[PDB]
């Protein structure tokens, strides 16, 4: 048939006739991709073909270069670069013609230009691109679409490009973008598209923004865009301001007062929601920069040098202008309130909260006057703003200013939980819970506990929005009463903390709330199963009466559920019914943990039978949902030696939980599962290790797993090492491989995306060796024997340990295990092991840091690890 025909059948409402098109298209794309792409672009450039045939042709080209999947996206680019220049240039050529010659509102060529660009930019193989793109939009004769679709192409380029690439062409790109934003530009479309482009390009503006002349030339144009009559241009401009504020804070001195302040403040007042949002968002954002700065500064001054970046406290200087607006915005509620919606009202509230947490106590004096005037206001939209605003300033200022206010505000608050306006009772619950969460001393007043506990009981059976904030209101109360009794003075979960007196009614009332008909609304049901498991943690040791019944109550619900799922129906029966169950596989975790070793036996035998009987018909049927494993990893922490009854069923079912390589979020559990097993049998698990070997380290192939996944893979070999096994000596030579590749890995921590994990594959192998050295050496070792028999690598073991402290970044987690090793590793023996520690300078730079809390108790490792180091000289 004809290609145009096939492309035109890709949009037919006929399923099969559509199936046939997407098949013939994948056929010609396999027999010869180049010719296929060339022919496709040849259909894209020709303005004769129907609008359909061109969009389809453009969609194919796009899908052959990029993807929402990183790995696949990286391959589709290699396939492109693999194609010769003859076919490539031709495709690139036809893509350019299409620019401006389209009518399909959104340009298809744009996504193609970027798709190919992202593949030919890093290797400098599309020289015509940049100039042609800039010239296409700088030429006065360029039609509207020509200037529009060209800027949209640059936008996509800036988005999907490797950040460390568009540095060279920042100037020329920024030129084209700016020229499209100029107030002179007639087309608001070109303006809008030009502005959206700038936003994506702010990544590599950096040299460009570092020149006052250019920086100012930018800001000047960016500000005037916020004045453009077209709303889209305004928003797109204000968004830029927000990003320039976070990124380029240093150079906001000459713009804040002289310009920015007015624009942003005015934006807040604009009754055009979309605009008001960006305004409020802009100042709430600044509250996250000057916080990050005030926290970055309170460490530079503690290390003996000025901060790299210095704050200016614009949020503080604008406080008296923001509050009056933010509070007034809290008057514009949304009667029909769907908590999936975002608006100026919600944004304003969020902002005030950040302002309180940023300005510390500078906010109290400015918010109180608003509260008094409206907490008992005749209105409802105002009266709610008072209660709301109050709960928004509870965090930030010190108790030496709030507790008094909260005390005399408590009585007023309890009664408002029965106010006619449902909204008022909604905010009321959040506020009360917001109080006991951050001010337990005021929420646990001898003459308010009973009245308060009376108010929350009635709230459990109210509307979700008002009742959901009750479950949490209880949680914080339990959380507080647990540290108002353990203040203490005693070690254990006190026999009788405050709530233990009325506790019996609460737990027997949470079972009703969680089993309400209207459970899906506002996540009330979920919040009910939640407040329960949390209320249990913060229980007392004479609260054992209900914990028993409640446990069997949960079980009776659990067993019943895991029988309809052996024979599942439709979707209103799959994830639909396992919903309540999932919440149970978390309540059981918090009851099986806090219960007597006695009861947790009859339970651990009936509960286990439920988790596995359901396992024999849920795998593989959508599951395993990775929840039964969680539960199991808590039965082991309960039994220890009584995990013998089962195990065998777990042998295959846990064996498949460790084999899944597709769900890189699931295997996570089955691994830590085996970890808890080493603390169970402890003497008979060796044969259960060969699995993880070439079935988890085999997951390292290919590399489409995840950045987070890596440590647990090996970190669970250390705990396995506690069982005589002489095969840990045969993975030692593989553990010396991973921590050796993380070093070779030039993970450029230029942005805070690479660092947040960078120092994590290190804390991994550490736990490994620790377990290895231990299991292979008892207190007294008749034959040690292989401790020093890792000598040559102990170089890197202590050099990469030094390299761990070498870089200016390594979480106290890595620091912790880094310390633990040195210690007991010197216990293996001290044979020039001290002259090997004195070998590298930055070794004590870490030990000292270790001795320097934070963290609490991590520090004790590096503080004691110096004893054995001080045992020879």
């Amino acid at each position: 048939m004809e290609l145009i025909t096939i492309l035109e059948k890709t949009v037919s409402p006929d399923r099969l006739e559509l199936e046939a098109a997407q098949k013939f298209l994948e056929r010609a794309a396999v027999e010869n991709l180049p010719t296929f792409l060339v022919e496709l672009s040849r259909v894209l450039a020709n303005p004769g073909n129907s609008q359909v045939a061109r969009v389809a042709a453009g969609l194919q080209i796009k899908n052959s270069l990029t993807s929402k999947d990183p790995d696949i996206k990286a391959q589709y680019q290699q396939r492109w670069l693999a194609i010769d220049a003859n076919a490539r240039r031709e495709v690139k050529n036809y893509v350019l013609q299409t620019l401006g010659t389209e009518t399909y509102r959104p340009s298809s060529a744009s996504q193609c230009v970027a798709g190919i660009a992202c593949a030919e930019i890093p290797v400098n193989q599309w020289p015509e691109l940049i100039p042609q793109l800039v010239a296409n939009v700088t030429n006065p004769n360029s039609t509207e679409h020509m200037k529009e679709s060209t800027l949209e192409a640059i936008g996509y380029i800036c988005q999907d490009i490797d950040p460390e690439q568009l540095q060279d062409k920042s100037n020329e790109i920024l030129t084209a973008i700016i020229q499209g934003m100029r107030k002179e530009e007639p087309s608001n479309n070109v303006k809008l598209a030009a502005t959206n482009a700038l936003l994506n390009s702010l990544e590599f503006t950096k040299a460009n923004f570092d020149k006052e002349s250019e920086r100012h030339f930018i800001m000047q144009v960016v500000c005037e865009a916020t004045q453009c009559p077209d709303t889209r241009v305004r928003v797109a401009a204000l968004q830029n301001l927000v990003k320039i504020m976070s990124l380029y804070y240093q150079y906001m001195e000459t713009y804040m007062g002289p310009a920015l302040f007015a624009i942003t403040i005015e934006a807040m007042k604009s009754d055009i929601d979309e605009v008001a949002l960006q305004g409020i968002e802009f100042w709430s954002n600044v509250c996250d920069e000057e916080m990050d700065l005030a926290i970055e500064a309170s460490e530079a001054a503690e290390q003996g040098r000025p901060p790299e970046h210095t704050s200016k406290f614009y949020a503080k200087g604008a406080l008296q202008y923001l509050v009056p607006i933010l509070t007034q915005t809290l008057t514009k509620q949304d009667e029909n309130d769907d908590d999936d919606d975002w608006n100026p009202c919600k944004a304003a509230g969020v902002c005030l909260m950040l302002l309180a947490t940023c300005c510390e106590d500078d906010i109290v004096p400015h918010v109180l006057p608003f509260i008094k005037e409206h907490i008992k206001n005749p209105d409802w939209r105002y009266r709610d703003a008072a209660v709301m605003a109050f709960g928004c300033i509870l965090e930030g200022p010190e108790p030496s200013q709030l507790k008094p206010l909260v005390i005399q505000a408590m009585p007023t608050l309890i009664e408002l939980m029965k106010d006619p306006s449902v909204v008022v009772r909604d905010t009321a619950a959040w506020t009360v819970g917001r109080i006991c969460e951050l001010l337990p001393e005021a929420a646990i007043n001898d003459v308010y506990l009973a009245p308060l506990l009376q108010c929350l009981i009635e709230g459990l059976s109210a509307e979700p929005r008002v009742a959901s904030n009750v479950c949490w209101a209880f949680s914080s109360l339990a959380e507080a009463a647990y540290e108002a009794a353990d203040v203490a003075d005693d070690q254990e979960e006190p026999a009788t903390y405050c709530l233990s007196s009325s506790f019996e009614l609460i737990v027997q009332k949470l079972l009703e709330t969680t089993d309400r008909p209207d459970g899906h609304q506002n996540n009330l049901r979920s919040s009910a199963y939640e407040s329960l498991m949390e209320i249990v943690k913060n229980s007392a040791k004479d609260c054992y009466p209900a914990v028993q019944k409640t446990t069997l109550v949960i079980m009776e619900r659990l067993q019943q559920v895991l029988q309809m799922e052996s024979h599942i129906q439709s979707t209103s029966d799959r994830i639909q019914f396992n919903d309540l169950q999932s919440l149970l596989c978390a309540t059981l975790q918090n009851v099986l943990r806090k219960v007597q070793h006695q009861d947790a036996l009859q339970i651990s035998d009936v509960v286990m039978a439920s988790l596995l009987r359901m396992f024999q018909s849920t795998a593989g049927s959508g599951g395993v949902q990775e929840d039964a494993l969680m539960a199991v990893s808590t039965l082991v922490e309960v039994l220890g030696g009584e995990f013998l009854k089962y195990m065998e069923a777990f042998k295959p079912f846990l064996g498949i939980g460790l084999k899944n390589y597709a769900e890189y979020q699931v295997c996570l559990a089955a691994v830590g599962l085996v970890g808890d097993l080493c603390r169970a049998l402890q003497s008979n698990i060796i044969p259960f290790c060969d699995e993880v070997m070439q079935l988890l380290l085999e997951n390292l192939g290919n590399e489409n797993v995840h950045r987070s996944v890596k440590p647990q893979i090996l970190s669970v070999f250390g705990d396995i090492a506690l069982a005589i096994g002489g095969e840990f000596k045969k993975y030692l030579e593989v553990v010396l491989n991973t921590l050796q590749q993380a070093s070779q890995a030039q993970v450029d921590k230029s942005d805070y995306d690479m660092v947040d994990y960078l120092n994590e594959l290190r804390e991994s192998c550490l736990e490994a060796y620790t377990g290895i050295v231990q299991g292979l050496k008892g207190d007294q070792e008749n034959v040690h024997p292989d401790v020093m028999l890792v000598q040559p690598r102990v170089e890197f073991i202590l050099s990469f340990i030094d390299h761990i402290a070498g870089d200016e970044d390594h979480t106290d987690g890595v620091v912790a295990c880094a310390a633990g090793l040195i210690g007991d590793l010197c216990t293996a023996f001290g044979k020039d092991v001290l002259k090997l520690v004195e070998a590298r300078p930055m070794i004590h730079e870490l030990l000292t840091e270790g001795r320097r809390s934070k963290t609490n108790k991590a520090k004790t490792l590096a503080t004691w690890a110096t004893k054995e180091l001080r045992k020879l000289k």
Binding site: K346, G349, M353, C471, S527, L583, M630, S633, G820, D824
Partner: protein
């Protein structure tokens, strides 16, 4: 955007906090058990 901060509670039911509290409990039981024979 900042909707997860609109009346931010402490109801750890989302994906992350479900696995971390337990994954941190295990490391606890580790540095406890593991280092029971260490010193």
């Amino acid at each position: 955007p900042r909707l997860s901060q609109y009346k931010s509670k402490y109801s750890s039911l989302e994906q992350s906090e479900r696995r971390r509290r337990l994954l941190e409990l295990q490391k606890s039981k580790r540095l406890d058990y593991v280092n029971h024979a260490r010193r």
